[PDB]
Amino acid sequence: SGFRKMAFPSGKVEGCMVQVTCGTTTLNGLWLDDVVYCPRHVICTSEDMLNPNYEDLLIRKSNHNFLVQAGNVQLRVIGHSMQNCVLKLKVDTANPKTPKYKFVRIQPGQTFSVLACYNGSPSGVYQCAMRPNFTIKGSFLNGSCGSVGFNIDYDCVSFCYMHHMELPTGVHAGTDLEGNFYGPFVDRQTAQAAGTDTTITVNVLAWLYAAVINGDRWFLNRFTTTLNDFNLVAMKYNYEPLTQDHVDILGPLSAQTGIAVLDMCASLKELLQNGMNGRTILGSALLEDEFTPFDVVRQCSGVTFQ
């Protein structure tokens, strides 16, 4: 009963957060096995940030320029390389709290939990989604860089995000754990702007299903729609196109409630055209697009992690 924006339990990631210092710049690193991953801009001074030559700056560094701290313990750095926009520091000690993990690159619309860290110490956990414009709507201050996003698959932590920067209107950008940016952003102090964001239609439909499961039904109507007619209306409200794959992915949720996906789409179409008329769904006065179909199943069926 009840429906909440809900993050993965973070303990397995907390055990991997360290502090990385290079000169006068401190931020967070991820310690897995005998490697520490962090944003490469830990090697810049403020005066390099406008147009840094990172390859050049890294040559000028030595293993001893990197101070890595896990709690009170300094970890000795015995090697360093750069992959895309992440720095990899080889340390002499493997992290005893390393979980099973992998690195994945997620797609727009997928969700993940963020463990916000400052000086290598976990501060908070929240859920968000990779927006269609490749930003995230996070909560990050100075010091947070190197905070990671992740999912848990049973006992396996999939890391999908590492935090690097803030963009106009207070949204955020970063890389996968191979150091490739999501979207066309670059790690430098330069005017950049995200494109117009859109609403993740498949997620909105998942959340309408969550609403019905939790007993909110008023928006169900007597109509169906074709996929084409649905998209004609949705394009007009800055919604992502709903594809046949999305329809097929919502099928388990449709079986659980007895409401066919295209019947749900006809209800959404009416909500977009007529508005909510002052009314709420699962306590919200707007349509929520940061639960995937899997997040809804997970929450409404209590899938667990260890």
Rounded Cα distance, 226 and 215, in Å: 26
Check binding of 140 to ligand A1H9E (CB under 6 A).
yes
Helix (H) or strand (E) holding 55: helix 54-59
Widest CA span of the chain, in angstroms?
Answer: 69
Check binding of 246 to ligand A1H9E (CB under 6 A).
no
List the one residue from 6, 78, 94, 156 that touches a copy of itself (CB under 8 A).
Answer: 6
Residue 118 touches which of ligand A1H9E, a copy of itself, none (Cβ within 5-8 Å per kind):
a copy of itself
List the one residue from 34, 48, 166, 197 that touches a copy of itself (CB under 8 A).
Answer: 166
Rounded Cα distance, 131 and 64, in Å: 39
Q: Please answer whether residues 104 and 93 qualify as being in contact, where contact means their C-beta atoms are separated by less than 8 angstroms.
A: no
Per-residue contact string for residues 113-142; x = within reach of a copy of itself by CB under 8 A: --xxxxx-xxxxxx-x--------xxxxxx
- SS3 state of residue 208: helix
Distances (CA, A) of 141 to 42, 44, 63: 16, 18, 28
Residue 145: active-site member: yes
List the one residue from 166, 178, 197, 263 that touches ligand A1H9E (CB under 6 A).
Answer: 166
Rounded Cα distance, 273 and 231, in Å: 13
From 41, 163, 164, 246, active-site residue: 41
Q: Which is nearer to a copy of itself, 109 or 138 (CB)?
A: 138
| Candidate segments 14-22, 54-62, 87-95, 138-146, binder of ligand A1H9E by CB under 6 A | 138-146
Rounded Cα distance, 154 and 99, in Å: 11
Check binding of 40 to ligand A1H9E (CB under 6 A).
no
**Closest distance to ligand A1H9E from the beta carbon of 202 (Å):** 28
Residue 163: active-site member: no
Residue 145 touches which of ligand A1H9E, a copy of itself, none (Cβ within 5-8 Å per kind):
ligand A1H9E
Q: Please answer whether residues 16 and 28 qualify as being in contact, where contact means their C-beta atoms are separated by less than 8 angstroms.
A: no
| Structural tokens at position 24 | 């006068």
Q: Please answer whether residues 8 and 305 qualify as being in contact, where contact means their C-beta atoms are separated by less than 8 angstroms.
A: yes
Q: Which is nearer to ligand A1H9E, 12 or 40 (CB)?
A: 40
Per-residue contact string for residues 186-205; x = within reach of ligand A1H9E by CB under 6 A: -xxx----------------
Rounded Cα distance, 37 and 95, in Å: 13
Check binding of 258 to a copy of itself (CB under 8 A).
no
Rounded Cα distance, 252 and 206, in Å: 10
Which 213-232 residues touch a copy of itself, going by CB under 8 A?
214-215
* Number of residues near a copy of itself (by CB under 8 A): 55
Reference 205, options 234, 178, 182; nearest CA is 234
Pairing of strands 100-103, 156-167: parallel
Q: Which is nearer to a copy of itself, 43 or 114 (CB)?
A: 114
Catalytic residues: 41, 145
For ligand A1H9E, the binding residues (CB under 6 A) are 1, 27, 41, 49, 140-145, 164-168, 172, 187-189
